[PDB]
Amino acid sequence: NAMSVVILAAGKGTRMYSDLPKVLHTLAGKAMVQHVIDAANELGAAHVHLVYGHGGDLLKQALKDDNLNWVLQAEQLGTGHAMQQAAPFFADDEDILMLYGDVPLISVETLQRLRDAKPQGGIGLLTVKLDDPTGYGRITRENGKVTGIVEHKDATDEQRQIQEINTGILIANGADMKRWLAKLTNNNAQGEYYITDIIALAYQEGREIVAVHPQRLSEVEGVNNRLQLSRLERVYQSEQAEKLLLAGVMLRDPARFDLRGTLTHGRDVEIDTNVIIEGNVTLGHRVKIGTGCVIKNSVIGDDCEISPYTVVEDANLAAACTIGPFARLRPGAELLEGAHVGNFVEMKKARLGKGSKAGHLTYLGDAEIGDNVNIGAGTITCNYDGANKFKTIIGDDVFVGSDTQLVAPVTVGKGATIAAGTTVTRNVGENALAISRVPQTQKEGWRRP
Amino acid sequence: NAMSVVILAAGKGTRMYSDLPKVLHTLAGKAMVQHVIDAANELGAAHVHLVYGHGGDLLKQALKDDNLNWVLQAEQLGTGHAMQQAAPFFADDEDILMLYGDVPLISVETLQRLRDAKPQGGIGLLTVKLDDPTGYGRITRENGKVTGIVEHKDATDEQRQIQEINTGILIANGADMKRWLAKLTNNNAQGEYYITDIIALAYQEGREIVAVHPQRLSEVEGVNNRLQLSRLERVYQSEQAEKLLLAGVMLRDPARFDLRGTLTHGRDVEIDTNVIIEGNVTLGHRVKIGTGCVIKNSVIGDDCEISPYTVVEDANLAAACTIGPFARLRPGAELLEGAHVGNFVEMKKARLGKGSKAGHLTYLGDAEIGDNVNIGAGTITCNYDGANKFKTIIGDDVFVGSDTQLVAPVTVGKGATIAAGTTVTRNVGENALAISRVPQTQKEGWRRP
Amino acid sequence: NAMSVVILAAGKGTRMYSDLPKVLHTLAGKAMVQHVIDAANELGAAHVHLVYGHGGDLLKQALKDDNLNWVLQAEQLGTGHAMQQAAPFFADDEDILMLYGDVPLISVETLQRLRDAKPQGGIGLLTVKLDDPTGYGRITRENGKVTGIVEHKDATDEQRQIQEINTGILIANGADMKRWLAKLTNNNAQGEYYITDIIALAYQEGREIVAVHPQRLSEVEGVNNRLQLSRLERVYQSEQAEKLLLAGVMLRDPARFDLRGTLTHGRDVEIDTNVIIEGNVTLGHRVKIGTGCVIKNSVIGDDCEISPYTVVEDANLAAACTIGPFARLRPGAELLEGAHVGNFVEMKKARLGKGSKAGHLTYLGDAEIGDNVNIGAGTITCNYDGANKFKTIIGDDVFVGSDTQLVAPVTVGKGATIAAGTTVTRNVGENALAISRVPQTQKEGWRRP
Ligand SMILES: CC(=O)SCCNC(=O)CCNC(=O)[C@H](O)C(C)(C)COP(=O)(O)OP(=O)(O)OC[C@H]1O[C@@H](n2cnc3c(N)ncnc32)[C@H](O)[C@@H]1OP(=O)(O)O
Ligand SMILES: CC(=O)SCCNC(=O)CCNC(=O)[C@H](O)C(C)(C)COP(=O)(O)OP(=O)(O)OC[C@H]1O[C@@H](n2cnc3c(N)ncnc32)[C@H](O)[C@@H]1OP(=O)(O)O
Ligand SMILES: CC(=O)SCCNC(=O)CCNC(=O)[C@H](O)C(C)(C)COP(=O)(O)OP(=O)(O)OC[C@H]1O[C@@H](n2cnc3c(N)ncnc32)[C@H](O)[C@@H]1OP(=O)(O)O
Ligand SMILES: CC(=O)N[C@H]1[C@@H](OP(=O)(O)OP(=O)(O)OC[C@H]2O[C@@H](n3ccc(=O)[nH]c3=O)[C@H](O)[C@@H]2O)O[C@H](CO)[C@@H](O)[C@@H]1O
Ligand SMILES: CC(=O)N[C@H]1[C@@H](OP(=O)(O)OP(=O)(O)OC[C@H]2O[C@@H](n3ccc(=O)[nH]c3=O)[C@H](O)[C@@H]2O)O[C@H](CO)[C@@H](O)[C@@H]1O
Ligand SMILES: CC(=O)N[C@H]1[C@@H](OP(=O)(O)OP(=O)(O)OC[C@H]2O[C@@H](n3ccc(=O)[nH]c3=O)[C@H](O)[C@@H]2O)O[C@H](CO)[C@@H](O)[C@@H]1O
Ligand SMILES: [Mg+2]
Ligand SMILES: [Mg+2]
């Protein structure tokens, strides 16, 4: 049936020492609250209600999911008060799932089990048994059935012995929720409005509350400071690394691999230590990635070998390309089949053709380079005049002597050769040798300072 | 006495998602099955029988140990059936040790203890007590003596309570083995031929089976998927790192060090984080290796300092050399005493003499450079004309101005100076200044675009 | 009241395989014994007595704290004998705290608690309960009170059951210490003089011994080999990383962060994996540090972004600078606001002005570069003539064409343009174009080898 989600993110993240709202701090390259929103949508949420207290401008800039209904909670008078701010927007005939904006690892599988356990006209509750339940809501039961929740501060010493605690996540019909929310009072230890009081209220009406537990404790851990965020980051990376290994991707050290986005891949891919994958990356079959590489929003074809310490962003490599070590590909870098880029070579908005090579100490920017081309060490395409950028065109079968400067815009015809140390300011004819050289001379018995 | 080893590697590695046979996947830069073969030979095996089912071409390409006897097992009808395929090759007077091709960490010390425990005319068995013995063969005993093995599938619930399980490794006389192997039947739960049935068969004959245990569980863990391979990789790296530390090598972080081959070393060597050692590497006394370096098949003399992010392969450094950070030495790179290579410098088949320096943005390929030489930033030896490679020779005491292009083949005489920005196409005399410079001129009030 | 500290560092570090005295091996970039000395001074020590046996020259070179009193212990006849060598220097009216030179993580907080527990005329003792107390001094008690210490070798089997052991750290009045030290005998299992015998001696006099425990076992762990040193290094890095996270510094992976010195910082600093901070580093607000960077003795202003694999030492960056990836800043490198240094760029004793850029394959050494300057790829300041270093001056608004060689000493006037491929040997006038170019020519139908 129909279901909407409410995410409470209006608390204050004091122990973060940040000018950025807590729920906006990232985990795996994505805002913590975005992880929660993705979970809600992945579960099938019709609407996602986001309850916030401040940093609204920043939140709105960062969060732009279409089905987001922004709900203000000016004063943080408790989770109960927060839900009251969203309640008017709940549909009487839909389920309402409540989540926290700072509990990023909640899994859709567990939420789905929770939805399934929710009884008609009742409440589905997510609980966990902890060795030390200190500080959390205690689940009370009567003849095995959940009858309420007692907050740590309000709980007696004996009640504090209860180890089954409230994760905070629960689900119930919207009309029922409105009914219970209207009856909340702040006559308790904290002097706030407890969303947890709706459990006793439902039980009193004869409705049943059923509790289900998460697969892992990490799923329901909340983040209040950077150290906690750090730990969840590791858990997330570890689980992703493990899935990749089980899916056939060889990671030389799963503890030294970070994925911050999406990784699409073929068979027999090998990834060495300390590699970082960002944004959306596609890897063909047998791609080998050497240690320390950083690859972002790029496409890498079959059989490519990316040598150590290579940085790649918004690049496209055809099959059998070899780049690095110490290569740097920037947006627009394109390599055709079998192309090669060596050490200390940078490419930006440049295309290197089939079997073409740029082995060293080179800059290729705003260029189109043909097939079977050899770019000597030290070559530079001078694409910028201080105000505009210009294109360099190199036809097939060209041999560029080392330390050549190509002053764009310029075109080098097919089959040409450019002598070492040339400054190319004009088009070069096909099968011609371009040169601008001073004959070597010599001064005898030269004494250095 | 005489002993041969049989390695069963004919099972199918389905959960690997690979086109490469499972036992060929590497651990520490070596095929898993090669680890097992090395163990067999290290223990003293006269012959090593390798039982395979497919990928024979790939296996034969990768494995080339002289004492390997390849045994085919076309249909995988069980470990018992696999041993029957090798049995005809067992000598009646030698011990036969059975190992698995996908259990890479088995230690020679444990195998040696197993050999020693084997009773005359009996069987030495390797067992381990697990908290959860699910899925493994259960060891049955009568008055403390091993009398048989019952496979998980064939075992009753009560028998499944037995926690001592079969690691799979065992040893027995060859003639005895042939005798028992001939009597195997496939009337069991799996409908296969269990090598494990020979335990009961030996006991029935009045022969004794003695069980010994491994030092660590990791020693007998098998690999069926990449995640399991990953874990064993870490265990292996951790133990190697620990031995190195105990041997006097300082690793700044043993969890961030990888050795894939052999490391020979002197005293007081310091290796920072994320260093990777491949093939055969020799390090003299007091060598210091900065973070992220990759060193392969190289020799590094006393007191060298390899700065951060330097890649080295098939290179030879004399004492007191300093290279990096961001230096890249390729095959044939040779540095004599006290030589220096700085950042963004690449060397290939090139020799840099005593106290000689190439501090920046340089390429030295196919060159012989004398002592007390200074190579300025931007210098390039143009060793390739598009079809052939040529040599560059630089005598002692030469000062090469920055951004010099040396067009090989060419020789620079001793004591020469090469002016900055020179293109050297001809030999330079001794103590002479080579130059090819356009005098600097100027155009007044130049307006850029 | 007054207190002095005695550090016993005269034992022999055999299992280190080093030519450097054991206590001089570093942990977090500092000698193990220096960690102990810092603890002593941090606690308020008037004098720090260092008892050594050899390597005195090396120790004296490395250790130079003003309040250090060097005490020789030629023969290592036991901790008791070692203390006797320092005793003559104890003041009758000061407390004497004994520490070990190879127990680097002892915390000042625990030492302070120990000082506070010391009873008038008695002894404060630091003890710990271990699961396996093997090899350590056993604490004996009578009616709950500490009455002595029995060394493992001298202890009976029943006494070896005692799990509360001596960490070795203790404190007592100096006059009392001298009194007890004079009565030590070497009639025991080791045939040495046990400092531990003073416990029974004090108890016999009617003085009381009070025991306090450390916060963590790591605090009192001693180092005898490199593997143990390694573990303490990790503990130290982990605790420092954790404090930084709690202080508001975001570390993408606290297990892959190393701090070897001091880190001062603003708010919202983000540090990616494998970054290493050395010496004294200051980071402004919102500084972002990409993976693998090494930063030493440097200052980094607000909003700077240091891209991957950048090495920085003794550099000063104003606000909003962007450098890397693969940039290398050496001592004296200074960037003014908004400056930019790209890949494969090296700077040494050079200043780059406001909004100035050096994006690629460049060397800037001994230079002063103005604001709004563009340094093209391949540019090199030739600061060295083989004997002397010279300065390069570039005024504001200069555009330097790529692959330009500037032969220092030289000055480029404000607003000038330097053509690509120029060798600049003379001053360039303001708003003028400097050039030294051979016009491009062409040879038809050139056939390569
Ligand atoms: C590390 C790396 O990247 S290696 C890969 C890149 N390789 C390089 O940079 C090396 C490129 N090679 C060169 O620049 C060479 O000097 C070449 C190709 C120009 C010369 O080729 P060579 O076989 O040595 O020819 P060489 O110079 O001796 O031949 C003489 C001819 O050149 C011409 N020549 C020499 N100098 C000049 C000049 N300044 N202007 C015009 N023509 C000249 C002569 O007029 C003569 O003409 P001809 O063929 O009609 O007789
Ligand atoms: C970052 C780093 O790698 S730094 C280390 C590497 N260093 C370098 O690249 C710097 C090298 N230095 C140079 O290239 C210099 O310009 C040098 C060595 C050639 C000039 O040395 P200087 O002391 O400045 O001499 P200067 O040019 O003023 O002397 C004039 C002489 O040069 C000659 N000269 C100048 N230009 C030319 C030319 N195009 N052709 C021939 N001779 C010339 C003059 O004929 C004159 O000859 P003379 O000695 O008989 O009087
Ligand atoms: C990857 C990067 O770093 S990109 C950023 C760095 N950018 C660069 O290195 C590109 C720099 N640009 C150049 O070097 C260009 O060749 C420039 C600026 C010198 C030429 O500018 P252009 O717009 O193409 O002018 P162009 O050469 O066609 O103009 C002709 C003039 O140059 C002069 N000229 C050309 N060659 C020479 C020469 N050898 N000696 C003297 N003057 C010359 C002519 O006399 C003429 O003078 P005029 O203005 O009075 O008519
Ligand atoms: C009364 C109540 O609900 N108690 C539960 C709550 O504790 P408790 O209320 O103490 O927990 P928190 O203060 O951390 O608040 C929980 C979540 O609600 C948000 N928030 C809170 C108050 C507010 O006015 N607005 C708002 O948006 C916070 O930003 C956070 O995401 O979570 C615990 C799990 O962590 C449960 O064991 C407790 O039973
Ligand atoms: C009947 C038998 O022996 N059972 C043992 C076997 O289980 P089990 O037979 O189930 O184990 P596996 O199927 O993994 O086979 C073990 C090894 O034998 C090889 N293989 C197997 C069958 C075949 O026809 N050819 C072949 O080469 C596999 O490649 C693997 O290297 O190992 C377990 C340890 O892991 C033991 O606890 C079991 O008692
Ligand atoms: C007799 C004595 O004191 N026993 C204690 C000592 O053991 P034990 O005496 O066996 O310990 P060590 O030999 O390691 O010596 C402790 C420290 O004293 C130094 N040293 C030792 C002897 C010497 O002549 N000069 C010298 O400087 C060592 O360099 C080391 O820093 O430490 C243990 C904790 O580790 C305690 O549990 C033991 O009760
Ligand atoms: Mg150049
Ligand atoms: Mg040049």
| Closest Cα in chain A, distance from residue C245 (Å) | 5
- Amino acid identity of residue C37, one-letter, is I
- Strands A95-100 and A3-8 come out as parallel
Please report, for chain A, how many H helices and E strands are present, in that order.
7, 36
| Dist CA B157 CA A265 (whole Å) | 43
Q: Do A250 and B229 touch (CB under 8 A)?
A: yes
Contact B43, B97 (CB under 8 A): yes
Q: Do C311 and B291 touch (CB under 8 A)?
A: no
Top mutation candidate among B15, B79, B102 for ligand 5, by most atoms within 8 Å of CB: B79
A102 lines ligand 4 (CB under 6 A): yes
Query: Both B251 and B218 in a single domain?
Result: no
Tokens representing residue C75 in the block: 């023969």
CATH of the domain at B54: 3.90.550.10
Contact A390, A406 (CB under 8 A): no
Torsion on CA atoms C152, C157, C158, C159, rounded to nearest 10: -10
Query: Both A243 and A210 in a single domain?
Result: no
Nearest residue to C381 (alpha-carbon basis) of C337, C417, C351: C351
| Dist CA A67 CA A49 (whole Å) | 8
Residue A13 CA, closest ligand 4 atom number: 29
Q: Final residue of a domain: which of C179, C196, C224?
A: C224
Nearest residue to C25 (alpha-carbon basis) of C9, C43, C1: C9
Taken in order A346, A350, A351, A356, the sign of the CA dihedral is negative
Query: Both A206 and A328 in a single domain?
Result: no
Ligand 7 mean position, distance from CA A180 (Å): 76
> What b-and-e string marks burial along A162-201, b requiring 16 or more CB atoms within 10 Å of the CB?
bebbbbbbbbbbbebbbebbeebeeebeeebbbbbbbbbb
| Closest Cα in chain C, distance from residue B193 (Å) | 47
* Helix ranges restricted to H, A45-173: 56-62, 79-86, 108-117
Q: Final residue of a domain: which of B224, B248, B279?
A: B224
Q: Do B421 and C431 touch (CB under 8 A)?
A: no
Tokens representing residue A193 in the block: 């409005």
| Dist CA B208 CA B199 (whole Å) | 9
Contact C413, C399 (CB under 8 A): no
Identify the residue whose C-alpha is closest to ligand 1 atom 20: A419
| Dist CA A117 CA A13 (whole Å) | 33
Query: Both C126 and C258 in a single domain?
Result: no
Identify the residue whose C-alpha is closest to ligand 1 atom 1: B382
Environment class of C267 (CB within 10 Å of its CB; exposed 0-12, middle 13-18, buried 19+): middle
| Dist CA B89 CA B48 (whole Å) | 10
Query: Both A215 and A332 in a single domain?
Result: no
Residue A381 CA, closest ligand 3 atom number: 1
Q: Do A361 and B382 touch (CB under 8 A)?
A: no
The region, left, alpha or beta by phi > 0 then psi within -120 to 50, assigned to residue A45 is beta
Query: Both A328 and A372 in a single domain?
Result: yes
Residue C446 CA, chain-centre distance (Å), reads 61
Identify the residue whose C-alpha is closest to ligand 5 atom 32: B168
Q: Is A383 annotated as a binding residue?
A: yes
Q: Which residue has the tokens 């994760």?
A: A167
Across the interface, of A20, A309, A429, the residue whose CB is closest to C444 is: A429
Contact A277, A256 (CB under 8 A): no
Cα angle vertex A25, ends A22, A31, to 5°?
115
| Dist CA B361 CA B26 (whole Å) | 36
* DSSP letter string, A319-386: TT-EE-SSEEE-TT-EE-TT-EEEEEEEEEEEEE-TT-EEEEEEEEEEEEE-TT-EE-TT-EEE-B-S
| Dist CA A437 CA A421 (whole Å) | 7
Ligand 8 mean position, distance from CA B423 (Å): 8
| Dist CA C34 CA C177 (whole Å) | 25
Q: How many domains does chain A have?
A: 2
Look up the domain containing A383 and give its range: 225-449
Torsion on CA atoms B370, B374, B375, B381, rounded to nearest 10: -20
Q: Do A440 and B435 touch (CB under 8 A)?
A: yes
3-state secondary structure of A218: helix
Q: Do B248 and C363 touch (CB under 8 A)?
A: no
Ligand 4 mean position, distance from CA A57 (Å): 23
| Dist CA B275 CA B293 (whole Å) | 5
- Amino acid identity of residue A68, one-letter, is L
Cα angle vertex C92, ends C90, C93, to 5°?
110
Strand ranges (E), B223-290: 250-251, 257-265, 270-271, 275-283, 288-289
Contact A303, A285 (CB under 8 A): yes
Contact A265, A249 (CB under 8 A): yes
Strand partners of residue B96:
B4, B172
Query: Both C247 and C159 in a single domain?
Result: no
Q: Is B29 annotated as a binding residue?
A: no
DSSP summary character for residue A119? P
Given the residues A35, A47, A340, A360, the one annotated as active site: A360
Chain A residues whose CB is inside 8 A of the B433 CB are 442-443, 446
Task: Tell me the C-alpha to C-alpha distance, in Å, between residue B16 and each of A169, B22, B59, B223, C384.
Answer: 38, 7, 16, 10, 58
Strand partners of residue C278:
C260, C296
Tokens representing residue C3 in the block: 């207190």
| Dist CA B91 CA C90 (whole Å) | 78
Task: Tell me the C-alpha to C-alpha distance, in Å, between residue A261 and each of A35, B14, B123, B249, C407.
Answer: 12, 28, 55, 39, 48
Chain A residues whose CB is inside 8 A of the C445 CB are 431-432
Chain B residues whose CB is inside 8 A of the A399 CB are 386
Q: What are phi and psi of A24, to 5 degrees?
A: -90, -15
Nearest residue to A403 (alpha-carbon basis) of B249, C359, C209, B377: B377
SS3 letters for B130-175? CCCCCCCCEEEEECCEEEEEECHHHCCCCHHHCCEEEEEEEEEEHH
3-state secondary structure of B9: coil
Residue C35 CA, chain-centre distance (Å), reads 9
In this structure, how many other beta carbons lie within 10 angstroms of the beta carbon of residue B70?
Answer: 14
Q: Is B206 annotated as a binding residue?
A: no
Could you tell me which residues come within 8 angstroms of residue C341 by beta carbon, excluding any fewer than 6 positions away?
A: C321, C322, C323, C324, C327, C329, C335, C347, C352, C357, C358, C359
Could you tell me which residues come within 8 angstroms of residue A236 by beta carbon, excluding any fewer than 6 positions away?
A: A27, A28, A104, A105
Task: Tell me the C-alpha to C-alpha distance, in Å, between residue B172 and each of B2, B115, C350.
Answer: 11, 9, 75
* DSSP letter string, B311-372: EEES-EE-TT-EE-SSEEE-TT-EE-TT-EEEEEEEEEEEEE-TT-EEEEEEEEEEEEE-TT
Residue A399 CA, closest ligand 1 atom number: 6
Query: Both A85 and A141 in a single domain?
Result: yes
Q: Final residue of a domain: which of B169, B196, B224?
A: B224
Q: What are phi and psi of B310, to 5 degrees?
A: -115, 140
Chain A residues whose CB is inside 8 A of the B438 CB are 438
Tokens representing residue C223 in the block: 């180092």
Chain C residues whose CB is inside 8 A of the A362 CB are 361
Contact C59, C17 (CB under 8 A): no
Contact B426, B409 (CB under 8 A): no
Query: Both B191 and B248 in a single domain?
Result: no
Ligand 7 mean position, distance from CA C166 (Å): 67
Rg of chain C over CA atoms, in angstroms? Answer: 31
| Dist CA B222 CA B217 (whole Å) | 10
- Amino acid identity of residue B152, one-letter, is H
Query: Both A413 and A348 in a single domain?
Result: yes
Mutate to test the interface with B, among C405, C427, C438 (most CBs of B within 10 A): C405
B165 lines ligand 5 (CB under 6 A): yes
Identify the residue whose C-alpha is closest to ligand 2 atom 15: B419
Could you list the residues of C known to form a binding site for UDP-N-acetyl-alpha-D-glucosamine, using ranges.
8-11, 22, 73, 78-79, 100-102, 137, 151, 166, 224, 330, 348, 363, 374
What is the chain B residue with the closest CA to C291?
B292
H or E element, residue A126: strand A123-129
Q: How was this structure determined?
A: X-ray
Tokens representing residue C317 in the block: 């960056």
| Closest Cα in chain B, distance from residue A248 (Å) | 5
Cα angle vertex A55, ends A54, A61, to 5°?
140
Ligand 2 mean position, distance from CA C404 (Å): 15
Task: Tell me the C-alpha to C-alpha distance, in Å, between residue A397 and each of A412, A436, B149, C443, C445.
Answer: 10, 21, 70, 17, 13
Cα angle vertex A162, ends A161, A164, to 5°?
145
DSSP summary character for residue A23? G
Query: Both C353 and C388 in a single domain?
Result: yes
* DSSP letter string, A264-315: EE-SS-EE-TTEEEEEEEEE-TT-EE-TT-EEES-EE-TT-EE-SS-EEES-
The region, left, alpha or beta by phi > 0 then psi within -120 to 50, assigned to residue B135 is left
Nearest residue to A277 (alpha-carbon basis) of A305, A251, A246: A251
Q: Which chains touch B (3 or more CB pairs under 8 A)?
A: A, C
Ligand 2 mean position, distance from CA C364 (Å): 20
Q: How many CB pairs under 8 A join B and C?
A: 165
Cα angle vertex A339, ends A337, A341, to 5°?
150
| Dist CA A290 CA A274 (whole Å) | 9
| Dist CA C294 CA C329 (whole Å) | 10
3-state secondary structure of C308: coil
Chain A residues whose CB is inside 8 A of the C398 CB are none
Contact A259, A240 (CB under 8 A): yes
Q: Which residue has the tokens 């009773």?
A: B119
The region, left, alpha or beta by phi > 0 then psi within -120 to 50, assigned to residue C78 is left
| Dist CA A322 CA A303 (whole Å) | 9
- Strands C26-27 and C30-31 come out as antiparallel
CATH of the domain at B434: 2.160.10.10
* DSSP letter string, B21-84: -GGGSEETTEEHHHHHHHHHHHHT-S-EEEEESS-HHHHHHH---TTEEEEE-SS---HHHHHH
Query: Both C203 and C267 in a single domain?
Result: no
Q: Do B435 and A445 touch (CB under 8 A)?
A: no
Contact B326, B312 (CB under 8 A): no
Mutate to test the interface with A, among C238, C243, C253, C385 (most CBs of A within 10 A): C253
